[PDB]
């Protein structure tokens, strides 16, 4: 009895990303995430989007 | 030529010494670097200078 996922995943854009597409046309994933680690100085991200 | 007169006067440590090809067959093939076999008692050891 395999425990397969029962639902498709989803990846809604963060509202702050929408400005970045208007800029140089690039939605890097979880732009809010990278902003925090740069201030804390932490290197590795806990989990990519 | 090392200091062979010392070795038989200096205290040592008894160790098991299993190895292939007799012992004269091993030392006699110069497998060791320095060696000093002699078939009798050695008069030369009591002198010190």
């Amino acid at each position: 009895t395999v425990s397969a996922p029962a639902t498709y995943g989803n990846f809604v854009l963060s509202p702050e990303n929408a400005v970045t597409a208007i800029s140089y046309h690039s939605i890097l994933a979880d732009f809010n995430s990278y902003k925090a680690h740069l201030t804390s100085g932490q290197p590795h991200l806990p989990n990519d989007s | 030529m090392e200091n062979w007169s010392a070795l038989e006067l200096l205290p040592k440590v008894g160790i098991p010494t299993d190895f292939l090809t007799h012992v004269k067959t091993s030392a006699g093939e110069e497998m060791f670097e320095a060696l000093r076999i002699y078939y009798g008692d050695d008069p030369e050891r009591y002198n010190i200078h």
Binding site: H25, I27, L28 | A27
Partner: protein
């Protein structure tokens, strides 16, 4: 827009000499003044049965 999903980087492995089984073949020792020494030696003695 040309979205860029999160970057990845490999985690380093932590190898050790003592943890390795090759260390069983060695009797490892530290010796801080090693640079000064030129040669070592271990004299042997064998009388034949």
């Amino acid at each position: 827009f040309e979205a860029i999903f999160g970057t990845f980087c490999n985690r380093l492995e932590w190898v050790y000499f003592l943890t390795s089984g090759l260390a069983a073949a060695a009797h490892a020792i530290k010796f801080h003044d090693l640079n000064k020494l030129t040669t070592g030696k271990m004299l042997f003695h064998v009388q034949v049965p």
